[PDB]
Design a protein around this ligand. Structure first.
Ligand SMILES: CCCCCCCCCCCCCCCC(=O)OC[C@H](COP(=O)([O-])OCC[N+](C)(C)C)OC(=O)CCCCCCCCCCCCCCC
Ligand SMILES: CCCCCCCCCCCCCCCCCC(=O)OC[C@H](COP(=O)(O)OCCN)OC(=O)CCCCCCCCCCCCC
Ligand code: HEM
Ligand code: HEM
Ligand SMILES: COc1c(O)c(C)c(C/C=C(\C)CC/C=C(\C)CC/C=C(/C)CC/C=C(\C)CC/C=C(\C)CCC=C(C)C)c(O)c1OC
Ligand SMILES: CCCCCCCCCCCCCCC(=O)O[C@H](COC(=O)CCCCCCCCCCCC)COP(=O)(O)O
Lengths: 126, 44, 431, 62, 54, 385
């Protein structure tokens, strides 16, 4: 319930500014590996809850080769967390492999449901 | 231009119900005077 | 385009259009399928087919004349098309098919070979044209025991009793001088059409068509032609709409343009501005619907026809479109009217001012019989550019809000719920 | 017999429909049943609710 | 008549007439059935026996 | 097909306890739902066998609890299994409302499941209170006097509601005798709202402690979570049996063994230990009308939790800030269960006013703020611009 267009509007304001990118991007990096989804072998875009119909849409527009790997790193996480262990340190998701692969499939489904409601309340000036 | 919506209940679908919802607030205020007048409760 | 009228007992209508390359000339009577009793029903469908018979059409095709006719509820029509330099040849043929003679068409060889041809057309219509045999069953149960109930095609049980003597008794009562308009559309001048009828005689009959003592009255009912061996379930549902020559004529069409028409397989009829599509596309409740506002002479109809393969969720197709009908009374927006103005101004301009001069002769013929002249398209745009959202709400509580409906269905309509759970959807109970 | 000839409903039909009247000789008798069921469900609630109030021998010791 | 438009059209004013028609039916029918029940039993009630104690 | 699927009754057993696909990664916090089902049968079965000996008059209330503990065979077992088991109901349930508050089980599509949680929680507070006033001890007479005199603050309808609620003019014989036939009943309303709580769960299934979709790896319930529940059943039976045989009156107040006397007030009236946080919220507002509202708002502020959580990730498992501030909320809730036991003294009024501001600023201020900051930090940590 935070609507990724609004995250990326805030988030791109931080990265664009030179002052705030020096300041709270190193806070953001230390926040990521303290969370430790990498240690379970997940990227971030496995963690997003898939029960709203916007995110339910963007998991159908995904290609087959990425929706097969994403459907494996989830099952490796349900198997690792079941044993109350972590993944071995070679199997951890590294920094470069943690890319927003599902972000552009959401921002084109969010803007396509924003336009559906901006156009369902249009008031035509006569 | 776009009217104020906030999800489902837009303003245009609320200005057309506020004449009738003023009658449901009268039809429920008389709904209390059936089920309470019978024990002393004076509303004014 | 400016229509023009003249009368000398036989009223002549013309709509000159020099940018066309044909010229329809025809006679349009004002006694269609709503002027027959149920024992001679189909005699106007059979008067169409002996005009279009093979013996008669071959005589017309020698001069380069194509024949066309139309049998509606209230008006008949008999149009002869030609090239624009050959309009007097079309009247000379039209004179010698109805007016000068009818005994050549009504020979015993040409009759029984044509009655056998119609009796196959109705038997093919009765079991193969499913979204239209419901709409002819909707009229047969809304206006029951009343002359607007009779099907235009003619029933098969009543058509095999017709002899030639019933073909002529209908001719001597309705094909009269005080009943017909001679229309000329396409590239034809009104002065050339009037002087050609004056140069000949072209006098049909005397006058005084019969009176039709019953008046059309809506009677809310239902009919269920249930038949499980069909792939879909066709359903029409209608309230009593407005007749022609009424102040609520264009509001009844604009209210049937708000909910429009839909086709589930087209990728551009799914993005329309209807609010009904947000409820109807989630589980694919229907394949197509269309909202009609039929307007006959005495009464009318207003409602929607549909067709669906989702035969277990019909009672959500009906309930979700009957809740949208309730919004016309209470909370129809201003935008939802302002698109239905601009769609009605288009699909009237695509009807009265399209290409085909045969179709323009039926519309000119149906208009000047009922209301004496033709209301032009430029002055029927001002009537649509003035319908406010108060006028739709005042009309909707008059005709839609808690009124009796007429239902007709066929196919797998077991999932269609009973009457009093469809009639009860017309009033919202939450308003 | 065809399916376009509806059978004889004439013994049960009204002699004059007039849908402003037929929906008023029928919303009277629904509204009258609603009126006695709102004066009859006040007394059913007020029987059980006033049963829990201060009884007779408690009121004597007031 | 036009009785349908004012009363039975909007359900918010239909059921507002049921409750305002039950508020009058409570007060009147109870008084009309009490004043009959004591008038049918005139001479047996305590309000009459208290009048014989003169 | 199999008879467990082909029968009309057994397919309700089959689709709920035998073949129900549970996610294969749920830890031991997912057993607290099965314990509350067992702990409800413990209260109900040790309520029927105890109410065969209980007379509910104000003269024979406290004298017939002691008749249970002295004269009935194994009567000390029933009264102690059920007075302590009711205090184990609220400890399992407080760990059941805090699993779901932690792992994001309140979020959509389980808002219907969460709202039947708050309805069961209100009836369970109202059940355990109405049976507390059935012992007619000294803390239970003056408990019912303090609680039902809060409804004398409603304007102009105050005294008529209270005098209807007491059934008299004070807490007397009709109040205790109606606080038993009500308290007999409301467990059967909880036992129906639980069936209306499994139906809201069965349509979308349980969550899992990662907060991701669990439709991929599912294992059945039979012989996997039946035998993972039998571990914590036999543990909950063990910690109950220490608190029943070896130390039975540890949780309850000692003043509840004085027979209830309306003429002598005790030293400090406190409720039983689980209503003690809400009693400290009620006591914090220096007004009587706002106190009844805020003590009732503190149960209803759980309903604004699905709409104030602004996170795209379900649950606090992979979050740094929203796991720290959750345990501040839990140890604030324990502190409110301590200021409820202290007297109205300096400085337990500045504490109980501050530590009730942190109860309400968690749902309304902390959770929307630190979960918006926990979504920009998940974003700008990965996106390079
Ligand atoms: C249970 C025991 C207590 C009974 C209390 C009844 C309270 C009064 C309700 C009775 C009443 O007035 O019902 C009328 C409404 C509508 O019922 P209707 O008349 O069939 O609906 C027609 C809607 N129009 C066309 C008028 C807009 O009906 C309703 O809104 C439905 C209410 C049903 C309550 C049960
Ligand atoms: C009306 C409003 C109702 C609100 C209820 C208020 C709370 C009621 C009090 C009950 C306390 C229940 C605490 C349970 C906390 C939720 C369960 C939990 O969060 O445990 C998981 C947590 C970390 O585990 P993860 O699953 O996140 O990590 C996986 C990594 N692969 O594991 C941990 O971090 C350790 C868990 C330690 C629990 C400590 C409990 C302390 C109890 C208070 C005792 C007070 C004595 C001083
Ligand atoms: C959710 C279910 C229940 C809860 C939380 C609950 C809670 C309580 C509590 C807290 C007490 C006071 C114990 C004490 O202080 O000694 C109590 C007492 C009592 N309850 Fe329950 N109860 C429940 C169900 C039932 C049922 C179903 C019955 C009866 C059929 C029942 C009958 C009694 C009786 C008779 C007492 C007698 C007083 C006593 O000996 O403690 N309870 N209950
Ligand atoms: C008598 C009391 C209760 C019973 C018998 C009960 C029963 C259950 C059971 C059996 C489950 C499935 C097991 C589990 O998921 O842990 C469950 C899940 C749940 N319960 Fe309850 N419950 C009770 C009270 C509550 C309360 C008071 C709340 C919250 C205010 C609540 C909220 C939930 C939630 C959110 C879940 C889903 C957790 C998840 O699976 O992600 N329940 N309940
Ligand atoms: C989602 O998957 C599930 C799941 O489906 C279920 C069902 C449960 C289990 C939860 C429950 C079973 C809770 C439901 C609880 C009830 C319905 C309470 C009903 C309890 C009762 C005890 C009913 C009352 C009946 C009696 C008291 C009859 C006993 C008779 C007595 C006392 C009289 C004795 C007299 C004589 C003369 C013998 C889970 O834990 C679970 O998660 C794994
Ligand atoms: C009703 C309120 C909720 C109560 C929560 C209890 C949840 C767990 C129920 C445990 C029942 C175990 C039966 C499993 C089974 O039969 O598997 C049977 C065999 O299992 C066993 O033999 C277990 C030995 C008997 C265990 C006795 C436990 C009784 C303790 C009762 C405590 C709870 C009331 C089939 O197992 P299989 O399919 O792997 O072959």
């Amino acid at each position: 319930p935070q609507s990724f267009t609004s995250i990326a509007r805030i988030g791109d304001y931080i990265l664009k500014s030179p002052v705030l990118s020096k300041l709270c991007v190193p806070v953001a990096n230390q926040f990521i590996n303290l969370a430790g989804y990498k240690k379970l072998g997940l990227k971030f875009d496995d963690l997003i809850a898939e029960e709203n119909p916007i995110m339910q849409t963007a998991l159908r527009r995904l290609p087959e080769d990425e929706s097969y790997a994403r459907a494996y790193r989830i099952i490796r996480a349900h198997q690792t967390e079941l044993t109350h262990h972590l993944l071995p340190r070679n199997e951890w998701i590294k920094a470069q492999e943690d890319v927003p692969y599902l972000l552009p499939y959401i921002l084109e489904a969010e803007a396509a449901a924003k336009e559906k409601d901006e156009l369902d309340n249009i008031e035509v000036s006569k | 231009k776009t009217g104020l919506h906030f999800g489902r209940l837009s303003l245009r679908s609320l200005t057309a119900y506020a004449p009738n919802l003023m009658l449901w607030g009268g039809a429920s205020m008389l709904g209390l005077f059936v089920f309470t007048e019978g024990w002393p409760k004076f509303q004014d | 385009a400016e229509v023009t009228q003249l009368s000398n007992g036989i009223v002549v209508a013309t709509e000159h259009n020099p940018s066309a390359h044909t010229a329809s000339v025809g006679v349009v009577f004002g006694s269609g399928a709503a002027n027959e009793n149920p024992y001679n029903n189909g005699v106007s469908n059979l008067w169409k087919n002996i005009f279009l018979s093979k013996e008669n059409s071959a005589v017309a095709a020698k001069e380069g004349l194509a024949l066309s006719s139309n049998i509606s509820r209230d008006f008949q029509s008999y149009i002869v098309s030609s090239l624009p330099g050959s309009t007097d040849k079309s009247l000379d043929f039209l004179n010698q098919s109805f007016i000068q003679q009818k005994a050549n068409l009504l020979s015993s060889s040409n009759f029984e070979a044509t009655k056998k041809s119609v009796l196959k057309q109705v038997q093919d219509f009765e079991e193969n044209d499913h979204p239209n045999r419901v709409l002819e069953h909707l009229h047969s149960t809304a206006f029951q025991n009343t002359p607007l109930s009779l099907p235009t095609r003619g029933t098969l049980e009543s058509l095999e009793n017709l002899v030639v003597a019933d073909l002529e008794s209908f001719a001597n009562n309705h094909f009269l001088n005080s009943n017909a308009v001679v229309v000329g559309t396409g590239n034809i001048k009104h002065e050339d059409l009037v002087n050609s009828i004056e140069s000949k005689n072209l006098s049909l009959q005397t006058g005084t068509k019969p009176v039709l003592k019953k008046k059309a009255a809506f009677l809310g009912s239902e009919v269920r032609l249930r038949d499980d061996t069909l792939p879909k379930a066709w359903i029409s549902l209608a309230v009593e709409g407005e007749p022609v020559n009424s102040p609520n004529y264009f509001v009844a069409k604009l209210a049937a343009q708000i909910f429009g028409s839909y086709n589930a397989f087209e990728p551009a009829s799914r993005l329309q501005g209807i609010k009904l599509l947000d409820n109807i596309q989630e589980y694919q409740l229907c394949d197509n619907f269309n909202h009609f506002s039929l307007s006959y002479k005495d009464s009318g109809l207003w409602g929607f026809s549909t067709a669906t393969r989702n035969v277990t969720m019909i009672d959500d197709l009906i309930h979700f479109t009957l809740k949208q009908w309730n919004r016309l009374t209470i909370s129809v927006t201003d935008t939802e009217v302002e698109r239905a103005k601009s769609l009605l101004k288009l699909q009237l301009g695509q009807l009265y001012e399209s290409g085909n001069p045969v179709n323009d002769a039926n519309l000119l013929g149906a208009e000047v019989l009922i209301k004496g002249s033709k209301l032009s398209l430029g002055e029927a745009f001002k009537k649509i550019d003035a319908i406010t959202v108060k006028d739709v709400k005042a009309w909707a509580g008059k005709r839609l809000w808690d009124q009796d409906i007429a239902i007709a269905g066929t196919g797998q309509i077991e999932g269609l719920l009973d009457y009093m759970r469809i009639r009860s959807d017309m009033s919202m109970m939450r308003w | 017999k065809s399916t376009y000839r509806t059978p004889n409903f004439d013994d049960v039909l009204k002699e004059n429909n007039d849908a402003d009247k037929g929906r008023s000789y029928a919303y009277f008798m629904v509204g009258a049943m609603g009126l006695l069921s709102s004066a009859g469900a006040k007394s059913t609630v007020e029987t059980f609710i006033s049963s829990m109030t201060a009884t007779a021998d408690v009121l004597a010791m007031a | 008549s036009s009785l349908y438009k004012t009363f039975f059209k909007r359900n918010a004013v239909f059921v507002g007439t049921i409750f305002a028609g039950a508020f009058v039916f409570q007060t009147v029918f109870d008084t009309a059935i009490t004043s009959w029940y004591e008038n049918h039993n005139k001479g047996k009630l305590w309000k009459d026996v208290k009048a014989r104690i003169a | 097909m199999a008879f467990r699927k082909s029968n009309v009754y057994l397919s309700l057993v089959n689709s709920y306890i035998i073949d129900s696909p549970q996610p294969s990664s749920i830890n031991y916090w997912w057993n607290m739902g099965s314990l509350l089902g067992l702990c409800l049968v413990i209260q109900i079965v040790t309520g029927i066998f105890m109410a065969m000996h209980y007379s509910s008059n104000i003269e024979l209330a406290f004298s017939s609890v002691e008749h249970i503990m002295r004269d009935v065979h194994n009567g000390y077992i029933l009264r102690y299994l059920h007075a302590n088991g009711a205090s184990f109901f609220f400890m399992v349930m407080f760990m059941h409302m805090a699993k779901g508050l932690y792992y994001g089980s309140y979020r959509s599509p389980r808002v219907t499941l969460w709202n039947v949680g708050v309805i069961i929680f209100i009836l369970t507070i109202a059940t355990a209170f109405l049976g507390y006033c059935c012992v007619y001890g000294q803390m239970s007479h003056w408990g019912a006097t303090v609680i039902t005199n809060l409804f004398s603050a409603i304007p102009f309808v105050g005294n008529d509601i209270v005098s209807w609620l007491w059934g008299g003019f004070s807490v007397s014989n009709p109040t205790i005798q109606r606080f038993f036939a009500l308290h007999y009943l409301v467990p059967f309303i909880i036992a129906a709202m639980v069936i209306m709580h499994l139906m809201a769960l069965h349509i979308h299934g349980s969550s899992n402690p990662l907060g991701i979709t669990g439709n991929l790896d599912r294992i059945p319930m039979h012989s996997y979570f039946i035998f993972k529940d039998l571990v914590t059943v036999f543990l909950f039976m063990l910690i109950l049996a220490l608190f029943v045989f070896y130390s039975p009156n540890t949780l309850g107040h000692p003043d509840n063994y004085i027979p209830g006397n309306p003429l002598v007030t005790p030293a400090s009236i406190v409720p039983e230990w689980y209503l003690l946080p809400f009693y400290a919220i009620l006591r914090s507002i220096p007004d009587k009308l706002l106190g009844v509202i805020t003590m009732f708002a503190a149960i209803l502020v759980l309903l604004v939790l699905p709409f104030t959580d602004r996170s795209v990730v379900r649950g606090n498992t992979f979050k740094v800030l929203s796991k720290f501030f959750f345990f501040i909320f839990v140890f604030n809730f324990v502190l409110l269960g301590q200021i409820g036991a202290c007297h109205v003294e300096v400085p337990y009024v500045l504490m109980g006013q501050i530590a009730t501001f942190i109860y309400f600023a968690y749902f309304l201020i902390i959770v929307p703020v630190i979960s918006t900051i926990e979504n920009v930090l998940f974003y700008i940590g990965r996106v390079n611009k």
